[PDB]
């Protein structure tokens, strides 16, 4: 399925990772009062206990805009 792999000043980049890592985890990790590093990727585990890094699951065609 399709998920936005990342965000950039130019625009979004939707991707379709194969049947491996069939899950879209989206993470926010807050490093500075003025910097929050962001990931949106494919993985194979939904629960994902967090080390203060807010994460959520997605398995749709547009979920991490």
């Amino acid at each position: 399925l399709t998920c936005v792999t990342k965000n950039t000043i130019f625009g979004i980049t939707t991707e379709n990772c194969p049947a491996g890592q069939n899950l879209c985890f989206k993470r926010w990790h807050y490093v500075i009062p003025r910097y929050t590093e962001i990931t949106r990727g494919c993985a194979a585990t939904c629960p994902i206990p967090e080390n203060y890094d807010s994460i959520h699951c997605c398995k749709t065609d547009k979920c991490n805009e």
Binding site: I32, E37, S54
Partner: protein, 280 residues
């Protein structure tokens, strides 16, 4: 030995830096208001910059330390938004203050009759207030209101980041403008001032003032360069830069505020001789 000693080290050094910044700013401005032998607009600009410097130093470093001591915002939010807006607005206000100091110096040097007697003291205070209110109305209401514009405080009750910095485009634009536009303006104005002064050439005091302005500009650019360099690097790839290096970079982003009160006495001879008297 493993982590507690490092935490004590960091907390103590940050507290010492905050205290030395506070005492330096208060002593230099008390000297300004007590000596009363100086009534130039540049000294009023220096006073305003020192006030902004103490605010930045004390409040920003204290709250950034209590944020970095654990990894979240221990306070029950609310104070987070106010402190964040205050820090960002006073940083921008200091940038605009240095901008208008550069404008004033370029105007004075480039024209011997650029209404030099029009300044007096009211114009300096008017310019300082104008820069402060401009920075305020430009940044603070946006900080307080765009979160509600989105609809709700998406920032959790334990985190203390900025809403629009989630968008990389906003980060890139604000960084490039609010750093390099003042930086390039300083560069071109410094070149113009140098050439005008060379063509034109009391001289000792004028050179002292020029060296003081140059030292302030150099300290500001040297301290704030790494932050913007890494911000640009984050526009090259995704997660090009680690996290602890980001922490240290934004930490020495306040080394400008640390340096300025000391550099005042380091470069200005009258400040140097007043420093010894006012330490006692």
């Amino acid at each position: 030995r493993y982590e507690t000693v490092e935490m004590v080290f960091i907390a103590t050094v940050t507290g010492s830096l905050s205290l030395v910044t506070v005492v330096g700013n208060i002593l230099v401005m008390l000297s300004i208001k007590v000596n009363r032998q100086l009534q130039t607009v540049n000294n009023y600009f220096l006073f305003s910059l020192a006030c902004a410097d103490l605010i930045i130093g004390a409040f920003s470093m204290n709250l950034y330390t209590v944020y970095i001591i654990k990894g979240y915002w221990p306070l029950g939010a609310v104070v987070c938004d106010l402190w964040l807006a205050l820090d960002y607005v006073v940083s921008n206000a200091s940038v605009m203050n240095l901008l208008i100091i550069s404008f004033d110096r370029y105007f004075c040097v480039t024209k011997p009759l650029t209404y030099p007697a029009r300044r007096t003291t009211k114009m300096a205070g008017l310019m300082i207030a104008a820069a402060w209110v401009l920075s305020f109305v430009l940044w603070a209401p946006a900080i307080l209101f765009w979160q509600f514009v989105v609809g709700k405080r998406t920032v959790p009750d334990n985190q203390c980041f900025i809403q629009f910095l989630s968008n990389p485009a906003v980060t890139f634009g604000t960084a490039i403008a609010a750093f390099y536009l003042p930086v390039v303006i300083m560069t071109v104005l410094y070149i113009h001032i140098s050439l005008a002064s060379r063509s034109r050439v009391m001289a000792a005091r004028e050179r002292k003032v020029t060296r003081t302005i140059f030292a302030i500009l150099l300290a500001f650019i040297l301290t704030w360069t790494p932050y913007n360099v890494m911000v640009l690097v984050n526009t090259f790839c995704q997660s090009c830069i680690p996290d602890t290096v980001w922490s240290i970079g934004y930490w020495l982003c306040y080394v400008n505020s640390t340096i300025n009160p000391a550099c005042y006495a380091l470069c200005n001879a009258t400040f140097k001789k007043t420093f010894r008297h006012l330490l006692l």
